[PDB]
Design a protein around this ligand. Structure first.
Ligand SMILES: Nc1ncnc2c1ncn2[C@@H]1O[C@H](COP(=O)(O)OP(=O)(O)O)[C@@H](O)[C@H]1O
Ligand SMILES: Nc1ncnc2c1ncn2[C@@H]1O[C@H](COP(=O)(O)OP(=O)(O)O)[C@@H](O)[C@H]1O
Ligand SMILES: Nc1ncnc2c1ncn2[C@@H]1O[C@H](COP(=O)(O)OP(=O)(O)O)[C@@H](O)[C@H]1O
Ligand SMILES: Nc1ncnc2c1ncn2[C@@H]1O[C@H](COP(=O)(O)OP(=O)(O)O)[C@@H](O)[C@H]1O
Ligand SMILES: Nc1ncnc2c1ncn2[C@@H]1O[C@H](COP(=O)(O)OP(=O)(O)O)[C@@H](O)[C@H]1O
Ligand SMILES: Nc1ncnc2c1ncn2[C@@H]1O[C@H](COP(=O)(O)OP(=O)(O)O)[C@@H](O)[C@H]1O
Ligand SMILES: [Cl-]
Ligand SMILES: [Cl-]
Ligand SMILES: [Cl-]
Ligand SMILES: [Cl-]
Ligand SMILES: [Cl-]
Ligand SMILES: [Cl-]
Ligand SMILES: [Cl-]
Ligand SMILES: [Cl-]
Ligand SMILES: [Cl-]
Ligand SMILES: [Cl-]
Ligand SMILES: [Cl-]
Ligand SMILES: [Cl-]
Ligand SMILES: [Mg+2]
Ligand SMILES: [Mg+2]
Ligand SMILES: [Mg+2]
Ligand SMILES: [Mg+2]
Ligand SMILES: [Mg+2]
Ligand SMILES: [Mg+2]
Lengths: 155, 154, 154, 155, 154, 155
């Protein structure tokens, strides 16, 4: 099946700037389904677990302080090739390099010791699965129809 | 204190139509702070506790079917006179009577056996307290600064 | 039945200013269904039939010049109490008196010898019937499901 | 003259999802002039005529069912190099590949047996001319000034 | 003549929150013409002249601190009955009482010792004249055609 | 420091079309700070000085008539790598070539004898400095905090 689920994190800079709604609307408008979502305040341990692949990098500590600065909104998006699609929508890691039209391209620029880039998106199906597990329990993910779902059925 | 918290529910019709982000943005743009939020699927038992005041009304059952139709997004908004403000932003219960500019006025219209109207908003500080305890534990509510908070402090 | 159809005309001033899409979106977002629509260029004869009720008024001629100035977009919107709802969304006849949030309130202001106000909306179910027959043949009106129609059915 | 006319079809998925207005606004905002437009319900014959170049392709039947599923909004856009411009605005055929900022990039993703991609745009001046003829009579296309037209006159 | 000019000030809270463009767009979309505009940083002396009518009120000092907190954008809007129209678009002085759809209604809420409300708008043609002279020289005010001006001329 | 200031001009076509607000919002949303701004009516001399590098080009005269046609809004934007960032946001010189999502890509298309492209952005730090000087006096540029400035401080 082409249907995939990816993990998205609306980072502290987006939350503080009041951009939660604008970001969610971009996914809803794209046709992606929100099967899970909640506002939480990530602590060091969970943050270092999510960003485990960067534990041995110079900017690690700044990243942890950044992602745990204020509450974030974690959510699981479901849809056709959702992982690559959401990555494309996010834009280049450093927002100054992100193309106009992408989330980072339109909303990000300024940075602290960490490259503040509005949101996080799983880079692969493998990462998505591992990441979704860290933030969501099966009981927090739902199966339900979005308005136009019936339109895409294959007779 | 003028700062108060209110409970908002982005109803199944809003979720299905993909209006979650647009509704949330209206509050963020107003200066309201999201101190708690999560997508959940309300069951009949919890729904009836929330809408206890309507238990004796003709539309009760249909209202419970409606609010439990699909998952919803429950959230707590904090800000100066948040309760009356959000109620004002929401608009009249029946979307056809809601003024343009309000959430129900701009997004609502069609109905089922229940009057579908995009969102729910606590009707008083007392009710918000009750409704918030119904959906959230203290550990799901947060205190943090929004970008412009410093501007208003003395 | 609460479902009714109303006739809307996106006037020459709206067309010239490039507001067709924005106006249409307001209706789509409300949950109203476009069951008919087309860009046409109304001539004096058809215009006078449409605005027959104003034939004896001082501003009649200027109103006919205005509505026939450039092409317009005539469309039929369907939905629960569509007539009064669209009228509500449109706002006061004179844009300066129209409330912010309404179409005339947000987009209208400047006038000519006619009170330019972005759009026209039928004033009753009876008038809509009459006006729709004036601009559309039955074959130009369609019945189809909008994405969320199923949500409201029992 | 650089002024060209292209044929645009707001396909059934966009109509059902209530995206007609948002799509039209993008063209109006770009400065393109709507010289013709109407909501119609395409039947098999007309659909197979419009997509004549794909009659011998595997996905043909799905495309015909798709484009004739519900009423559509056909319109003729006029403006400087309108054909290539509108194609660029549309984005890649498969919306998952369309760049953020384009119509398909922002609005499309899910597919049925046909690659549902929000809208159709003539691929060439030749196609535009042939396509405009299939849907519009000369009497349905108009010549009128848009607000800023006077600004671009060449003294 | 119905065409008049009014003075608007996009207050420090609006500037800090990055709402300058959104506020300006509301006026442009209404059909109002920007004939003058500039970012400046008002000092106490100029601020008190602008708000002279409030010199004897309890909130005077806090109002002067507020309007001089950060730079602001002062602009002159021209159009049919521009004064009452902009006042209508702005909404009630206290944002919590401002109707959804208005600028203060959609963007304002939080306050300091002064009632922070996004923008200032002249309350009469007479006051606008006075306020415009306070911030602009004749050479900073312009007469030019907006795209659709020709549509309204006879 | 990565913080730079660039000079932006909302050209006559954008002013006449009532696009001033929409353009400003894109920068504000990106996180760029407006440290200077004002509506002025550029005269020939100042225009030929701003576009000094094009004095020996065929389209020079058309450009001067264009940029001095109606009042414009000049503004100085401040932010991390603002010069390259704003250039990216502007899009390709000829708006028909500008990508969807960019200012020129979304708003520009039609041209007169000059390639009307909605706005102007300094092409380099050197140009920015020279251009800012032509339109703004030090007394018209301000230092003040934007809402989220505190969020990016490097502890
Ligand atoms: N070199 C860096 N310096 C500081 N912070 C960085 C750097 N690289 C990445 N970051 C931060 O760490 C996050 C994760 O890094 P990475 O996985 O490379 O980016 P991506 O979000 O595109 O997958 C980035 O989104 C950004 O928030
Ligand atoms: N008469 C009615 N028939 C069907 N449903 C109704 C009716 N009145 C209200 N409702 C539904 O019940 C919900 C709760 O009722 P009430 O508290 O009176 O409205 P509100 O949500 O505006 O406070 C309304 O939001 C609407 O969804
Ligand atoms: N007094 C007037 N002078 C000039 N034009 C007017 C006047 N009153 C109304 N109009 C124009 O005639 C149109 C039709 O009049 P009416 O039906 O009374 O208003 P409405 O369109 O709100 O139903 C109005 O929309 C407006 O365009
Ligand atoms: N391989 C495919 N499978 C299913 N549907 C397709 C496929 N390719 C194209 N389509 C559908 O047929 C339409 C026309 O095909 P084509 O001309 O190649 O795309 P375009 O709209 O970019 O010109 C596409 O827009 C899409 O709706
Ligand atoms: N009672 C008050 N306490 C504190 N500040 C106030 C009070 N009333 C008004 N203000 C502030 O003073 C400004 C000017 O007052 P006033 O002219 O009465 O309101 P308006 O700006 O709506 O015309 C108001 O916009 C608001 O910023
Ligand atoms: N070949 C041309 N013909 C007419 N006008 C042009 C041409 N090239 C550029 N222009 C106009 O002159 C302006 C400045 O030229 P240039 O610096 O090359 O573009 P840019 O704004 O991308 O730096 C362009 O933005 C456009 O307004
Ligand atoms: Cl990118
Ligand atoms: Cl949907
Ligand atoms: Cl209401
Ligand atoms: Cl904020
Ligand atoms: Cl009204
Ligand atoms: Cl729908
Ligand atoms: Cl693309
Ligand atoms: Cl135009
Ligand atoms: Cl009000
Ligand atoms: Cl205009
Ligand atoms: Cl580009
Ligand atoms: Cl900010
Ligand atoms: Mg990564
Ligand atoms: Mg209630
Ligand atoms: Mg009438
Ligand atoms: Mg093709
Ligand atoms: Mg006052
Ligand atoms: Mg240049």
């Amino acid at each position: 099946s082409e249907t995939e689920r990816t993990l998205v994190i609306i980072k502290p800079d987006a939350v503080v700037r009041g951009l939660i709604g604008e970001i969610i609307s971009r996914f809803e408008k794209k046709g992606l389904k929100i099967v899970g979502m909640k506002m939480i305040w990530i602590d060091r341990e969970l943050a270092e677990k999510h960003y485990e692949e960067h534990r041995e990098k110079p900017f690690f500590k700044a990243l942890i302080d950044y992602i745990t600065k204020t509450p974030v909104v974690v959510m699981v998006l479901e849809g056709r090739y959702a992982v690559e699609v959401v990555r494309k929508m996010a834009g280049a890691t450093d927002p100054k390099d992100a193309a106009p039209g992408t989330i980072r391209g339109d909303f990000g620029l300024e940075v602290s010791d960490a490259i503040c880039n509005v949101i996080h998106a799983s880079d692969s199906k493998e990462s998505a699965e591992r990441e979704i597990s860290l933030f969501f329990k099966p009981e927090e993910l739902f199966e339900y129809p979005r308005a136009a779902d019936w339109f895409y059925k294959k007779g």
